[PDB]
Amino acid sequence: LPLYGEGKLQGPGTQAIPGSEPPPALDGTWVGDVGFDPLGFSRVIDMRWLREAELKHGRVCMLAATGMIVQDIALFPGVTKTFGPAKITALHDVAVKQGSMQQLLVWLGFLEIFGFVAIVQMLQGSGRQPGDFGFDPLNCGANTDTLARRQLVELKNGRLAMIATGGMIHHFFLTGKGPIEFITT
Amino acid sequence: ASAWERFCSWITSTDNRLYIGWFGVLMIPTLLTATTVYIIAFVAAPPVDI
Amino acid sequence: DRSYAMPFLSRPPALDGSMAGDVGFDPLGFSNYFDLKWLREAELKHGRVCMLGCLGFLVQEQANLPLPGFDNKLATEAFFSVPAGGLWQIFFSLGAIEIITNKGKLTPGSMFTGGRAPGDLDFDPLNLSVDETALRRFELAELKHARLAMIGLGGMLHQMLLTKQAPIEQLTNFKSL
Amino acid sequence: EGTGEALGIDDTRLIVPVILIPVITFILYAGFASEQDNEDFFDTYDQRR
Amino acid sequence: TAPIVHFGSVISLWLLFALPVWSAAYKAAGADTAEWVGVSQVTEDAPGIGLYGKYAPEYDGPTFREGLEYVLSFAWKPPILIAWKPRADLDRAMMDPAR
Amino acid sequence: DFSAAVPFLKRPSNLDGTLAGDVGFDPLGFSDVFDLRVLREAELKHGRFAMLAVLGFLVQEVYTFPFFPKMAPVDAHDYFVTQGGGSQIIFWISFVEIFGVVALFELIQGKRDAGDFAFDPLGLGKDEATLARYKVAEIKHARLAMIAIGGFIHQFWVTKQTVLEQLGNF
Amino acid sequence: MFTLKIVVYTTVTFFVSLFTFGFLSNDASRNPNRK
Ligand code: KC2
Ligand SMILES: CC1=C(C#C/C(C)=C/C=C/C(C)=C/C=C/C=C(C)/C=C/C=C(\C)C#CC2=C(C)C[C@@H](O)CC2(C)C)C(C)(C)C[C@H](O)C1
Ligand SMILES: CC1=C(C#C/C(C)=C/C=C/C(C)=C/C=C/C=C(C)/C=C/C=C(\C)C#CC2=C(C)C[C@@H](O)CC2(C)C)C(C)(C)C[C@H](O)C1
Ligand SMILES: CC1=C(C#C/C(C)=C/C=C/C(C)=C/C=C/C=C(C)/C=C/C=C(C)/C=C/C2=C(C)CCCC2(C)C)C(C)(C)C[C@H](O)C1
Ligand SMILES: CC1=C(C#C/C(C)=C/C=C/C(C)=C/C=C/C=C(C)/C=C/C=C(C)/C=C/C2=C(C)CCCC2(C)C)C(C)(C)C[C@H](O)C1
Ligand SMILES: CC1=CCCC(C)(C)[C@H]1/C=C/C(C)=C/C=C/C(C)=C/C=C/C=C(C)/C=C/C=C(C)/C=C/C1=C(C)CCCC1(C)C
């Protein structure tokens, strides 16, 4: 798994925190490794679980950010009748009573049972890498060098989407406005 | 070499001044209760509507 | 020569790697003064009770036999609703198995005379542990869940007593104070 | 009195001692019993303790 | 001769046949695959992991009665106040008069 | 020969000078009568209590938690001895102090250093040199906070003015 | 009244259980002619 940009991004000789050195778990092989782990979470918890959690959070939060934006730009027909005008976290409470969120929980949990099995199997030497669920129907990750880059994009956009979703939700708590309405203020 | 075995040996011991044994386990408390209540009721007890 | 769980304290001499739950934590040092086989058996037995007890708190609380005195969610107050008759015939069922599993040997001076390892009543229908590594990881998992479920039934029960609300209900209502 | 309760047990509390104290005594007796040679014998009584 | 007793009777025979059936299903197959192993997130270098799998530690220490007397000793003679007994090496028995 | 802190007095014998913040100050001479390690542990524990108390005294005055009512620090003890929390805090302190007793028994046999509990959760003073400087800083700040907590509380009693208030208006 | 009842039940059960499991503990062997 050669690292794209090894030397400028995600590789040795690029250590983020200049004064401090990184934990011994943070080797030069992992993706998006800028040598950043001040609180030292890596020595305690296995890196495979940690990258699984990072990729799961990033993939969930990219969907969450794009949902919070698209829900403002457009809405599926009929949601405005059942759900009244209802933004990020109020819509959660309304949709829980509606029962849609139960279905989301049921089916995402059904998928996460096999996600749990995959995490277990990787942690007992199945050879699977973190976040690799074999999902590439369009065959866009076939080329290896493009896959390398797309991995760091996935990590970095996941991080950016995590911070973004935190922003949108707490801006909603402040003003009670969505992303599009909040930016035009 | 077990606590119950030692207890049974002590109860069935021929070395106690007064033998207890398993029948004594039932006799001594019952007889002592009867003696105590009889003494207390004989020295002091209100009249009884026989 | 210092306990891992209690850095400040020195390691209990008895506590050791061989046990499978050892992290050096015996600050009192009971180990020094009781059969550690007996202590481990007691730990695993209490935990095996509590592991079922917490789920019971939870399942009884949501589903229940449709029998007439069997339906009362607050478990604390449920023990008495179902008749002691039933609770006694179950207590007697656990007695049978106590003596069945322990094979009559059920005192500290007799329990392990047959060579039975502590905490094993020879039960292993599934999740086989013939793999020592698997046995080694599963025993730590069992001990951690035993220890956690102890805290659990404790909280669930004392808490159900505190607010007369079963587990799931209490927190959702979470009437505080 | 004269009500017909089984073993006089009118309160359910009374059962806790009545069932448990034999069980603790049974547990203490089991340590004795498990230590004995429990094979059969052809005699009027067992001379092995 | 009731419909529900028949139902309970089928389930009783199910519970009775479960152990002879599934215990043997376990016996023949089992999890002796040499890959069935529990997996956890924390690094296994320091999980307080069990060593030697089942471990039974031979025991020849104080009797159970003596043990409960030790535990009774927590209230009868705890180790608290002994810290404030005088300096036990020599108390400066040769404390120089100047000091 | 003679303590630098008290030049007219002679240097207390057991106070050789190894422990942090040791300036040979023991006029009454408790070190000669008792183990210095036990006294050092008592000093560190009381001083840590006092440092937390001194910080909390001011943090309560500037900010009392919204779920709790607003009372000056001293007026609070009496409130929470009934609210319930008082019990919870003193309960947990006793829980930790039982293992403190175990650690003291270790200390008596010399298996543990005085005032040491391996608490560097974030590896602050992991440098040998720094741990020294920190040990000196810890003992001084503790010795100061012992005075500060007593002043704060005793001032409230003589003058109903949370320190911040009093300082504002004498 | 109930407290006295349960205390008496405790005492009676204790002594009856001692009698029961004591005579059940191979009492026939406790004779001077054994072995
Ligand atoms: C796993 C444990 C367990 C076992 C192995 C077991 C076996 C048997 C057998 C087998 C030989 C018989 C024949 C039998 C019979 C009865 N059982 Mg029992 N039973 C167990 C558990 C419970 C529970 C939880 C309850 C219960 C009850 C009753 C009643 C009610 C009589 C009444 O009250 O009219 C009767 C007649 C209920 C009760 O007594 O209360 C309503 C009750 O709640 N049982 N039970
Ligand atoms: C053994 C074995 C087998 C098996 C098996 C089986 C059936 C195993 C079953 C195991 C079970 C049921 C385990 C349950 C554990 C529960 C825990 C740790 C709960 C913790 C709760 C906590 C900390 C809490 C809390 C709370 C409290 C107190 C307050 C509340 O307000 C909130 C909250 C609710 C959060 C098989 C058959 C495969 C065969 C094999 O050969 C051997
Ligand atoms: C001269 C001399 C010597 C000496 C000496 C000296 C000067 C000794 C001085 C010792 C002193 C000043 C000790 C002070 C201890 C204070 C503590 C433990 C405070 C705890 C506070 C708590 C728990 C609290 C609280 C609270 C807070 C904060 C928030 C409130 O809402 C609630 C509440 C009120 C409960 C030496 C050493 C040489 C010996 C020599 O021979 C003679
Ligand atoms: C739906 C719902 C609810 C809800 C809710 C939810 C889901 C709430 C919360 C959501 C999320 C996504 C929170 C994210 C918070 C992120 C933070 C604070 C980022 C910090 C960044 C830092 C420190 C930056 C660090 C740094 C960066 C990047 C750059 C510089 C270096 C460094 C310092 C390392 C409720 C609770 C209202 C209930 C309701 O009934 C239902
Ligand atoms: C009563 C009570 C409570 C309480 C309480 C509490 C928390 C009480 C706390 C009291 C404290 C901590 C008092 C401290 C006094 C310190 C003194 C006198 C130091 C003098 C040092 C000097 C002169 C140093 C001298 C010096 C020396 C030696 C060396 C250097 C030179 C020099 C500086 C000159 C409540 C609030 C909980 C309510 C409850 O209902 C009951
Ligand atoms: C009363 C009642 C009601 C209804 C049924 C019935 C009548 C039979 C009766 C039954 C009562 C029963 C079953 C009671 C059982 C009591 C139980 C399970 C109590 C549990 C108590 C548990 C407690 C404290 C746990 C506290 C643990 C603590 C701090 C641990 C601290 C810690 C330790 C030890 C090491 C690591 C650090 C950490 C985590 C801080």
Automatic annotation (TrEMBL), chain B:
Compartments reported by the entry: Cellular thylakoid membrane; Membrane
Transmembrane segments: 19-45
PTM remark: C-terminally processed by CtpA; processing is essential to allow assembly of the oxygen-evolving complex and thus photosynthetic growth.
Top-rank taxon: Eukaryota
Family: Belongs to the reaction center PufL/M/PsbA/D family.
Biological role: Photosystem II (PSII) is a light-driven water:plastoquinone oxidoreductase that uses light energy to abstract electrons from H(2)O, generating O(2) and a proton gradient subsequently used for ATP formation. It consists of a core antenna complex that captures photons, and an electron transfer chain that converts photonic excitation into a charge separation. The D1/D2 (PsbA/PsbD) reaction center heterodimer binds P680, the primary electron donor of PSII as well as several subsequent electron acceptors. This is one of the two reaction center proteins of photosystem II.
Miscellaneous comment: Herbicides such as atrazine, BNT, diuron or ioxynil bind in the Q(B) binding site and block subsequent electron transfer.
Subunit structure, as described in the record: PSII is composed of 1 copy each of membrane proteins PsbA, PsbB, PsbC, PsbD, PsbE, PsbF, PsbH, PsbI, PsbJ, PsbK, PsbL, PsbM, PsbT, PsbX, PsbY, PsbZ, Psb30/Ycf12, at least 3 peripheral proteins of the oxygen-evolving complex and a large number of cofactors. It forms dimeric complexes.
Name of this protein: Photosystem II protein D1
Gene source species: Chroomonas placoidea
Full protein: residues contained: 11 to 60 of 360
From TrEMBL, chain G:
Coiled-coil spans in chain: none
Protein name stated in the entry: Photosystem II reaction center protein I
Originating gene: psbI
GO biological process, one term: photosynthesis
The protein's role, per its UniProt record: One of the components of the core complex of photosystem II (PSII), required for its stability and/or assembly. PSII is a light-driven water:plastoquinone oxidoreductase that uses light energy to abstract electrons from H(2)O, generating O(2) and a proton gradient subsequently used for ATP formation. It consists of a core antenna complex that captures photons, and an electron transfer chain that converts photonic excitation into a charge separation.
Membrane-spanning ranges: 6-25
The family this protein is said to belong to: Belongs to the PsbI family.
Lineage: Eukaryota, Cryptophyceae, Pyrenomonadales, Chroomonadaceae, Chroomonas
Subunit structure: PSII is composed of 1 copy each of membrane proteins PsbA, PsbB, PsbC, PsbD, PsbE, PsbF, PsbH, PsbI, PsbJ, PsbK, PsbL, PsbM, PsbT, PsbX, PsbY, PsbZ, Psb30/Ycf12, at least 3 peripheral proteins of the oxygen-evolving complex and a large number of cofactors. It forms dimeric complexes.
Keyword set, alphabetical order: Chloroplast, Membrane, Photosynthesis, Photosystem II, Plastid, Reaction center, Thylakoid, Transmembrane, Transmembrane helix
Primary location group: membrane
PANTHER family given in the database record: PHOTOSYSTEM II REACTION CENTER PROTEIN I
